[PDB]
């Protein structure tokens, strides 16, 4: 938002800043039935027992399906892959 | 002897080196989040995957070609020192001021 001042201008900038972060365990891909699934938008996360896929700037865990993953490859070339079931 | 003197800068070279090292460590262990809020950790291959995704190339291009990209980056970094040393007039802009 702009404002005027004697011999000048003053800007009021509005910004969004993240806060209250949390630690998680992550993997680059999910192996299932001999195929590697990558996320479309978001990262893979785990609270310790189960796996989820979430967005970047907010913690909103969702069940892993085939609607938000694309396979495009095999399960012997990616480093750090962790297998888990992928529902449908 | 004629009344002309040169004053020293406020920031010594050690402080500038500390600033540069802090920036490098922050951009290596956090990505770009340390410039917009709290620093959030992330593994480096994942950060490279997201930087690849930024320019329109999917993530699976990196994860299946990690070793080749790492070797190319290492060689590109290595050639820089020899390029700087061999060229005689590399740092001309900084010398012209003095
Ligand atoms: C990680 O998240 C999963 C999914 O929410 C948790 O599993 C649930 O835990 C609650 C708490 O007891 C149960 O009521 C649900 O029935 C569980 N879900 C299923 C599908 O069984 C899991 O507990 C979380 N991990 C930890 C350590 O809390
Ligand atoms: C995550 O864990 C590290 C070490 O285990 C710790 O230093 C850090 O504070 C943790 N993150 C948060 C948000 O507490
Ligand atoms: C899933 O990963 C585990 C742990 O790395 C491994 O022992 C197992 O062989 C994998 N599953 C299959 C079907 O190969």
UniProtKB/Swiss-Prot annotation, chain A:
The consequence of residue 67 to H is:
In strain: Alpha/B.1.1.7
Q: Name the gene for this chain.
A: S
Lineage here is:
Viruses, Riboviria, Orthornavirae, Pisuviricota, Pisoniviricetes
Residues modified by glycosylation: 23, 47, 83
Q: What does this protein's UniProt record list under function?
A: Subunit of the fusion protein that is processed upon entry into the host cell. Mediates fusion of the virion and cellular membranes by functioning as a class I viral fusion protein. Contains a viral fusion peptide that is unmasked after S2 cleavage. This cleavage can occur at the cell membrane by host TMPRSS2 or during endocytosis by host CSTL. In either case, this triggers an extensive and irreversible conformational change that leads to fusion of the viral envelope with the cellular cytoplasmic membrane, releasing viral genomic RNA into the host cell cytoplasm.
Q: List the disulfide bonds.
A: 31-75
Name-wise, this protein is Spike protein S2'
- Report which superkingdom the organism of origin falls in: Viruses
What effect is documented for mutating residue 50 to Y?
In strain: Theta/P.3
Swiss-Prot record, chain B:
User: Would you say which domain of life the source belongs to?
Assistant: Viruses
User: Per the record, which residues fall in region Heptad repeat 1?
Assistant: 66-98
Function recorded in the entry: Subunit of the fusion protein that is processed upon entry into the host cell. Mediates fusion of the virion and cellular membranes by functioning as a class I viral fusion protein. Contains a viral fusion peptide that is unmasked after S2 cleavage. This cleavage can occur at the cell membrane by host TMPRSS2 or during endocytosis by host CSTL. In either case, this triggers an extensive and irreversible conformational change that leads to fusion of the viral envelope with the cellular cytoplasmic membrane, releasing viral genomic RNA into the host cell cytoplasm.
The identity of this protein, by name, is: Spike protein S2'
Look up and give the organism this protein is from.
Severe acute respiratory syndrome coronavirus 2
Q: Which gene encodes it?
A: S
* Parent-protein start and end of this portion: 855 to 952 of 1273
């Amino acid at each position: 938002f702009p404002q005027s001042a004697p011999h000048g201008v003053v800007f009021l900038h509005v910004t969004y800043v993240p806060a209250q972060e949390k630690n998680f365990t992550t993997a680059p891909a999910i192996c299932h039935d001999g195929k590697a699934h990558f996320p479309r938008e978001g990262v893979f996360v785990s609270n310790g027992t189960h796996w989820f896929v979430t967005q970047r700037n907010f913690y909103e865990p969702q069940i892993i399906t085939t609607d938000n993953t694309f396979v495009s490859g095999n399960c012997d070339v990616v480093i750090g892959i962790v297998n888990n079931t992928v529902y449908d | 002897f004629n009344g002309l003197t040169v004053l020293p800068p406020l920031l010594t070279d050690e402080m500038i080196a500390q600033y540069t090292s802090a920036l490098l460590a922050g951009t290596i262990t956090s990505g770009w989040t340390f410039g917009a809020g709290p620093a959030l950790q992330i593994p480096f291959p994942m950060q490279m995957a997201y930087r690849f995704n930024g320019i329109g190339v999917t993530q699976n291009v990196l994860y299946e070609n990690q070793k080749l990209i790492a070797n190319q980056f290492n060689s590109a970094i290595g050639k820089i020192q020899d390029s700087l040393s061999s060229t005689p007039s590399a740092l001309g802009k900084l010398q012209d001021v003095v």
